[PDB]
Design a protein around this ligand. Structure first.
Ligand SMILES: [Zn+2]
Ligand SMILES: [Zn+2]
Ligand SMILES: [Zn+2]
Lengths: 7, 347
């Protein structure tokens, strides 16, 4: 898949 | 407790609905919206705490199921914005899935595929409704909460914007087609002679935007005016009582209204403003006050700003030959939550 992480 | 949840269900023969599929607890509150299973108090309060929280990237911010802040597997569909938490998948779908998934190239979340069940993850029968339904029942000062919309029933957005041309933005947001003719956006600068009948004929609306003119005052009309006309016009724009309801409106201020003339606005619009600042690494370039019914806009507030700051911030701007460049960037993302209600146009 495609990853991502936000603050 | 996530590692234990799968046992409990196939061993102690419980019913998912009895274990907080979020943190695998046993002290449930009220069942989980999206997938089959329950929710613990501490866990729910968070589910709420971040319902339509999006990010510059354009995708939802937290795990669709657990609200984890960790890394998340994103959907492969363009209609979807949901993201799924590494552990969540693995702990409920089966072991070694987040692997398989981070592997896959064209992935479709659980709230996106044909088969209803995968592992222990069970997408509720017609959730979308149950979700909002949850919102209401479970929050402590519920607000305007409109049921969401399945990807197939998402007609295009019909917009009306007063004083300010949004087009450019909603365009870049993926809300408007490329065909600039039936373009469901009507812009009107002068409405001082407009009557309810006009607005009605103007084609029915989905979103009414509008905002005060900027600091580089080009048009001479007491700020408070706009607040007022906007108000009026809107009621006209609204829909015939009892109709479904996908209806949103927003009013923006570039710090052009004063304390008095503002405490007013908030009375007419029925909601305390939501000032959004533009950061520059310690400094403070611009700001914007906002009013709207658009999903969670009362979370993107920066109480990190003080009145006494703006008052001055509005001094170094009237002290130059600046351009009436309207501070779009500020709200551009506020519209994001809508992606879940209306049609999106891939670029
Ligand atoms: Zn829990
Ligand atoms: Zn999806
Ligand atoms: Zn998760």
């Amino acid at each position: 898949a495609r990853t991502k992480q936000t603050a | 407790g996530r590692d234990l949840i799968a046992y409990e269900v196939k061993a102690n023969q419980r019913n998912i609905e009895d274990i907080c599929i979020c943190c695998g607890s046993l002290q449930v509150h009220t069942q989980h919206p999206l997938f089959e299973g329950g929710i613990c108090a501490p866990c729910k309060d968070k589910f709420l705490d971040a319902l339509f929280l999006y990010d510059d990237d354009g995708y939802q911010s937290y795990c669709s199921i657990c609200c984890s802040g960790e890394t998340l597997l994103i959907c492969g569909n363009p209609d979807c914005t949901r993201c799924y938490c590494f552990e969540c998948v693995d702990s409920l779908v089966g072991p070694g899935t987040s692997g398989k998934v981070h592997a896959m190239s064209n992935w479709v979340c659980y709230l996106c595929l044909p088969s209803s069940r995968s592992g222990l993850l069970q997408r509720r029968r017609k959730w979308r409704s149950q979700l909002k339904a949850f919102y209401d029942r479970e929050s402590e000062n519920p607000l305007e909460m409109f049921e969401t919309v399945p990807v197939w029933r998402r007609q295009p957005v019909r917009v009306l914007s007063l004083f300010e041309d949004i087009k450019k933005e909603l365009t870049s947001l993926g809300f408007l087609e490329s065909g600039s003719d039936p373009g469901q956006l009507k812009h009107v600068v002068d409405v001082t002679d407009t009557v309810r009948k006009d607005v009605e004929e103007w084609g029915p609306f989905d979103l009414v935007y509008g905002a005060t003119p900027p600091l580089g005052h080009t048009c001479d009309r007491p700020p408070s005016w706009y607040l007022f006309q906007f108000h009026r016009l809107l009621q006209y724009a609204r829909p015939k009582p009892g109709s479904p309801g996908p209806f949103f409106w927003m009013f923006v201020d570039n710090l052009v209204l004063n304390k008095e003339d503002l405490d007013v606005a908030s009375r007419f619009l029925e909601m305390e403003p939501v000032t959004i600042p533009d950061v520059h690494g310690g400094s403070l370039q611009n700001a914007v006050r906002v009013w709207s019914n658009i999903p969670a806009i009362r979370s993107r507030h920066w109480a990190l700003v003080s009145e006494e700051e703006l008052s001055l911030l509005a001094q170094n701007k009237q002290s130059s030959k600046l351009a009436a460049k309207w501070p779009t960037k500020l709200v551009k993302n506020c519209f994001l939550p809508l992606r879940e209600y209306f049609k999106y146009f891939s670029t």
